[PDB]
Ligand binder design. Structure first.
Ligand SMILES: *[C]C1=C([C])[C]=C2C(=[C]1)N([C][C]([O])[C]([O])[C]([O])[C]OP([O])(=O)OP([O])(=O)O[C][C]1O[C](N3[C]=NC4=C3N=[C]N=C4[N])[C]([O])[C]1[O])C1=NC(=O)[N]C(=O)C1=N2/[C]=[C]/[C][N][C]1[C][C]C2=C1[C]=[C][C]=[C]2
Ligand SMILES: *[C]C1=C([C])[C]=C2C(=[C]1)N([C][C]([O])[C]([O])[C]([O])[C]OP([O])(=O)OP([O])(=O)O[C][C]1O[C](N3[C]=NC4=C3N=[C]N=C4[N])[C]([O])[C]1[O])C1=NC(=O)[N]C(=O)C1=N2/[C]=[C]/[C][N][C]1[C][C]C2=C1[C]=[C][C]=[C]2
Lengths: 494, 499
C-alpha cells in the first residue's frame, strides 16, 4: 500500500535505484511484472551447464558502477578466454589473427578499413554524451541511416561487410534501421570503437562467476518483501496529493514519487492519468528494441584451444546464422562451450526453425570455421530468443530510427511531475549495458533525494572511482593509423 | 459480461465491425477507452462554428464503403470549394493556377516534375495492395527512406521541394522518417498520385454535412447500451474456452472472439495471456503514428473568393507553419473558414506556442499568401493537436520506418488465436482513411463469421458497388506526360548524339 517511492521494474536499474533509496532510509517498493527479477539479465541453472547467462553477461574496464555494485554484493569476475588466436571467416575461409581488429593485406582495402574505424571515432568526438542532439551536425547525421553513411564512407566491399557486421553486433539491428547520429553516439558513449569491440581491455573482457542474474537476485535478498513479483503496473494516477500505482492483479500502491525503470517503449503498457505530455506520448511509440537469439553450444572439451584458437569467431556473410562467437567455457576449464549471437533479421528468419534445427546449423557453421569435426558433436544446447519477451520487447537495448533522437531525445529522462526515469536507455556512459542500468537507476534515485531536499543539486550526478580489480588501459593509436589517407584522400593526392 | 464478440475500440472501424456482426444476429459489445466514440474523427459543435471536423473529414470518389455506410445512416456529402484558382506559394511569392498540380514553365524543371509523379506511380504498379512485401524490389525499396529516393530522383530543387511537401502532407512525417516501399505502397493503394492529391476527382472532394463524427455516433445509437464508454481495455486472456477481456475500471467481458480495432501500436496498452507471438510482440513497437495539428481560422466572409482564389494554398518553405490549406466554409456559404495542417516536425516545434500565438502566425501567413489584409481579422479559431492523444498516438495514421514493412508487414492482420484485427492500418484500399477503417472493420467481422461457419471463405473479402452520388472519373495522362524523358534521360540523348 503506502510508501515513499514505487520503483516500476526489477531489472538491474530498478534494483540499483531501490537499493540506494533503501540505504538512505526511505520506504521503497519494487513492482515487477515477471515471476523473477533481472529483466534483460537471466541466469539459468541446471546440472548440464551449472549456470549460464542467457541475457546480459559481459563486463569490462571503464564499467565501474556495475563492478562496484557487484563487488559489494559479494560477486567476482573472471576473464573471457582470449589467450589463443581469433578467427575472421570471410568468403568461406578462416583467417586467424591477434589483436582486436581483423588485419587487412591489400593496400587500398587497408586504407579503407583504417579510415572507417577512425572516422566513426572522429564523428563521435563531436557528439556530447549527455546531449547527442547538440552535436553541430545533429540533424544531418540524424536524417541518415547507418546504411547511407556506410555507403558513403566505405570504398571497398570488404570494409562495408565488416562495418555492417559491426553495426549488427553492437545494436542488434540492420544498418538501414538505425539513425547514424544515434549509432555514432552509442559507440562514443561506450568509449569508442576499440573499447566497445575489444575483449581484452574492452566491453567483453569479463563475466561474473555464477552469472549476472545474481546482481538483481542479491538486491532482492537485501530488500526482502519490498519486492513484489508478478505485479505488472497498468495504471499511474498523479491527479492527487500522493501518486497512485495500480497493478494487473488489482493491488494499489501509494507513493510520494515513482521511478520508471522499464524500457522506454514499455511505458506504453501503462495507462496514465493525466495523459503524458505530447512529446513523451509520441516518443514511447518511436523507440523499438533490437532482435537477437543468444545461443550456447556445449562440448566435452574446449577443443578449439588445441588448434591455437581462443573461440572468438567473426563470421561474414548472409548464409552464416551467427556472425560472432566467444568461448563460454567456465574459468575452471569445464563445461566447454561456444556462445554465439543470431543477429537482427537472422533472429527473425531463424526463429521459424526448431531448437534442434538451430543447433544443427550452428554446429555445421562452427565445424567449418574452426576446421574441426569435433564441433559436430555437441553434448548440450541452451538458447533464448529475446524477441518473444512481452516485458522486454527485445535485446540488447532500444535503438533510434532516423529522425527520432533529435526530435524526441531530450524527453527520455525528463521527469513527468513525480515520475523520474531510470533504465539503461537513459544512461550517459555505457547506455545499453548493465553499467548504464546502474548509472541511470542511481541517478534517478538521487533526483528524488534532491526533490525531497535531502541532497544538493550537484550530487544528482556522481562520478565513480575506477575499479582496482578491473583497471582500464588507455586506448592508443599509431602515427600511421592517425595520418594515413582515406581512399578518396589518396585519389586527391593523385 | 457474456457475448459473442468483443470489439476493442469505437472508432469507425470498430463501429463498422460491430454493426455488421449485430446485423448478422450476433451479440456484440464495443469497449471504448474514451468518453466518446469516433476516435480519430471528432466533430466539435458550438455556436461560433455550428460544427467542425477536428480529425478525419474528407471523402471522395473511389471511397465507396464509407460513402455507402454514411448514406445508410442518413448522412449527405457536399463538395469542398474548388471553383476559383488554387495558389502555389514558393520563395515568398504566390502563383495562382488550375488543375491538381502546380504548373511548371522551365523546360528542365518541367521534365523533372513530370518524371517525379510518373515514377511514383510506375514504382507503385509493382507493389501488390494486399502484400507490398511481395514487390520484386521490396527489400531494396524498404531499406531506403523517402529522402534517399527523392535525392536520387529529383534533379531540381523545385521538384524535390514539392515532393517533400507531398510526403509531409500525405503521411504527416518527414521524408527521412519513412520507408520508400511503404510510402509508395501507401500512395498506390489510394489509387495513385493524382487520386490522392486531388480535390475535384480525388480524396479531398467532399465532406459530410454535419461532420464525420456522426458516422460513429449514429452507429452507437443503433447499438444502444452495447457500446461501453470509458472502458479502456487492459488485459486479454485466451488460455480458456472463452476469451476474457478486462477493462481499466475492473469490468470483465467474456466472448467467443475479439476484434482489435485500435492503431497497431496501441496494442501495447494491453497485457496479453499467453504472450503475443514474437513477430507481433515486436511489430507493435515499430509502428508510430504521424504528427499533425489541424487548425481552422474563421472569418466574417470567404473574402478570398472575391480575388478569384478558392482557398487552396500549397505553401513551400520552412518558415511557413502550414504547408497546405482548403476552404472550410459551410456549403450554405456561411461560417467562412480556412483549414490548414501543421505537419510533422512543425507540429512538434509549434506545439510550444500558445493557441493565440499559433492563430497569429497562421493569419500573418494567410495574409501574405492571399495578398489580403482581411486575413488578419479572424472572428474565431479552433484547433486540435493529435500528438497529445493517449488513445490515438497521432494522426492521420501509422507510418513504417525503413526495414519494417518487409520484416513485420505480414503479421499486421494475421489472427492471434481468437483475436482478429481491424483498424484502417489493415485495409488494402485507402488504408489510413475513414474508407480503410470501414473496409478493415467489415473484413474482420466476416473473418469471424467464417470462423463460426456462417459464411464461406470467399465471402470474407467483398467488393463494393460504386457510389451513384460520388462517381469516379478515370485518371488520365497525356501522350507527352507518358513519353517525355527524365533529366538524366535527356542527358543520355545528348550523350549519344554527341558520340
Ligand atoms: C537481452 C540481452 C542479450 C541477449 C545480450 C546482452 C544484453 C541483453 N545486454 C543488455 C543488458 O542486459 C541491459 O542493458 C540491462 O539488463 C538493462 O537493465 P534495465 O535498464 O534494468 O532494464 P530491464 O533489464 O529490461 O528491466 C526492466 C524490468 O521491468 C520489468 N517490467 C516491464 N514492464 C513492466 C515491468 N514491471 C512492472 N510493470 C511493468 N509494466 C521487466 O520485467 C524487467 O524485469 C548486455 N549488457 C551488458 O552489460 N553486457 C552484455 O553482455 C549484454 N549482452 C550483450 C552483449 C553483446 N556484446 C557483443 C559481443 C561483441 C560486441 C558486442 C557489442 C558491441 C561490440 C562488440
Ligand atoms: C486525426 C486525423 C486528422 C487530423 C486528419 C485526417 C485524419 C485523421 N484521417 C484519418 C482517419 O481519421 C482515420 O483513418 C480513421 O478515423 C481511423 O479509424 P479507426 O481505424 O477506427 O481508428 P480510430 O479512429 O483511432 O479508433 C480507435 C478507437 O479505439 C479506442 N481505443 C484505443 N485504445 C483502446 C481503445 N479502446 C478500448 N481500449 C483501448 N486500450 C480509441 O479511443 C478510438 O476510439 C482522415 N481520414 C479521411 O478519410 N479523411 C480525412 O480528411 C482525414 N484527415 C486527413 C486528411 C488529409 N488530407 C490531406 C489534404 C491534402 C492531401 C492530403 C493527403 C494526401 C494528399 C493530399
Amino acid at each position: 500500500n503506502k510508501c515513499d517511492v514505487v520503483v516500476v521494474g526489477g531489472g538491474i536499474s530498478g534494483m540499483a535505484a531501490a537499493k540506494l533509496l533503501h540505504d538512505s532510509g526511505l520506504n521503497v517498493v519494487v513492482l515487477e511484472a515477471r515471476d523473477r527479477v533481472g529483466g534483460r539479465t537471466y541466469t539459468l541453472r541446471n546440472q548440464k551447464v551449472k549456470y549460464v547467462d542467457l541475457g546480459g553477461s559481459y563486463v569490462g574496464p571503464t564499467q565501474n558502477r556495475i563492478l562496484r555494485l557487484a563487488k559489494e554484493l559479494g560477486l567476482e569476475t573472471y576473464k573471457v578466454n582470449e589467450v589463443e588466436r581469433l578467427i575472421h571467416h570471410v568468403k568461406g575461409k578462416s583467417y586467424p589473427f591477434r589483436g582486436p581488429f581483423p588485419p587487412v593485406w591489400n593496400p587500398i582495402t587497408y586504407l579503407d578499413h583504417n579510415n572507417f574505424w577512425r572516422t566513426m571515432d572522429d564523428m563521435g568526438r563531436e557528439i556530447p554524451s549527455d546531449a547527442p542532439w547538440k552535436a553541430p551536425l545533429a540533424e544531418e547525421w540524424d536524417n541518415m541511416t547507418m546504411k547511407e553513411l556506410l555507403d558513403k564512407l566505405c570504398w571497398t566491399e570488404s570494409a562495408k561487410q565488416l562495418a555492417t557486421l559491426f553495426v549488427n553486433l553492437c545494436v542488434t539491428a540492420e544498418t538501414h534501421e538505425v539513425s547514424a547520429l544515434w549509432f555514432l553516439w552509442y559507440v562514443k558513449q561506450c568509449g569508442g570503437t576499440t573499447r566497445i569491440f575489444s575483449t581484452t581491455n574492452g566491453g567483453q573482457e569479463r563475466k561474473f562467476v555464477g552469472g549476472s542474474g545474481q546482481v538483481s537476485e542479491r538486491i532482492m535478498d537485501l530488500l526482502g518483501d519490498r519486492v513484489k513479483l508478478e505485479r505488472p503496473v497498468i495504471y499511474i494516477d498523479q491527479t492527487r496529493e500522493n501518486v497512485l500505482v495500480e497493478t494487473l492483479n488489482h493491488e494499489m500502491y501509494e507513493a510520494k514519487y515513482v521511478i520508471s525503470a522499464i524500457p522506454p517503449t514499455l511505458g506504453m503498457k501503462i495507462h496514465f492519468n493525466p495523459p503524458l505530455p505530447m512529446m513523451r506520448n509520441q516518443m514511447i511509440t518511436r523507440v523499438p528494441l533490437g532482435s537477437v537469439i543468444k545461443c550456447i553450444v556445449y562440448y566435452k572439451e574446449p577443443f578449439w584451444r588445441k588448434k591455437d584458437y581462443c573461440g572468438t569467431m567473426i563470421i561474414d556473410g548472409e548464409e552464416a546464422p551467427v556472425a560472432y562467437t566467444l568461448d563460454d567455457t567456465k574459468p575452471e576449464g569445464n563445461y566447454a562451450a561456444i556462445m554465439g549471437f543470431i543477429l537482427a533479421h537472422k533472429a527473425r528468419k531463424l526463429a521459424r526453425l526448431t531448437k534442434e534445427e538451430r543447433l544443427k546449423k550452428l554446429c555445421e557453421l562452427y565445424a567449418k570455421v574452426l576446421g574441426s569435426l569435433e564441433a559436430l558433436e555437441p553434448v548440450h544446447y541452451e538458447e533464448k530468443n529475446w524477441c518473444e519477451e512481452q516485458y522486454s520487447g527485445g535485446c540488447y537495448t532500444t535503438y533510434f530510427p532516423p529522425g527520432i533522437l533529435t526530435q524526441y531525445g531530450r524527453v527520455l529522462r525528463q521527469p513527468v511531475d513525480r515520475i523520474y526515469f531510470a533504465g539503461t536507455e537513459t544512461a550517459t556512459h555505457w547506455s545499453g549495458y548493465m553499467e548504464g542500468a546502474v548509472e541511470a537507476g542511481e541517478r534517478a534515485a538521487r533526483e528524488i533525494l534532491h526533490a525531497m531536499g535531502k541532497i544538493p543539486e550537484d550530487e544528482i550526478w556522481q562520478s565513480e572511482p575506477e575499479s582496482v580489480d578491473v583497471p582500464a588501459q588507455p586506448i592508443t593509436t599509431t602515427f600511421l593509423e592517425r595520418h594515413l589517407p582515406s581512399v578518396p584522400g589518396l585519389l586527391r593526392l593523385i
